[PDB]
């Protein structure tokens, strides 16, 4: 199937960035969601940051791949 429309929009936005900015900005985006939404349950926080790190792959940043793990704040 085609992807969910929201995921496709995310890829369009990510394509407005250079490959070497993608992981840093996705970390920033993940922290913004975690804080704004008050996500605190451990598995939800982990899945939040994991989902962010995996986005470059589906958005075809082959030179990036999956973003490296970084210890989650707080």
């Amino acid at each position: 199937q085609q992807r969910p429309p929201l995921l496709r929009l995310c890829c369009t936005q990510l394509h407005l960035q250079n490959p070497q900015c993608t992981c840093s900005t996705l970390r920033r985006a993940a922290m913004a969601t975690r804080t704004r939404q008050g996500i605190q349950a451990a598995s939800q926080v982990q899945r939040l940051f994991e989902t962010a790190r995996h986005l470059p792959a589906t958005c075809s940043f082959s030179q990036v791949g999956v973003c490296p793990f970084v210890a989650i704040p707080a």
Binding site: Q17, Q20, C21, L26, A29, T33, I39, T51, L55
Partner: protein
């Protein structure tokens, strides 16, 4: 590298890309599906 290179500015690209707002919604949707 040089003064006239492409010189990416990641924070500027982030705001120009709407702070990846659709990615934020997607990340939020996936997070609350945990477990």
């Amino acid at each position: 590298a040089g003064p006239f290179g492409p010189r990416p500015s990641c924070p500027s690209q982030f705001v120009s890309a709407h702070r990846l707002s659709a990615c934020q919604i997607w990340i939020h949707s996936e997070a609350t599906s945990a477990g």
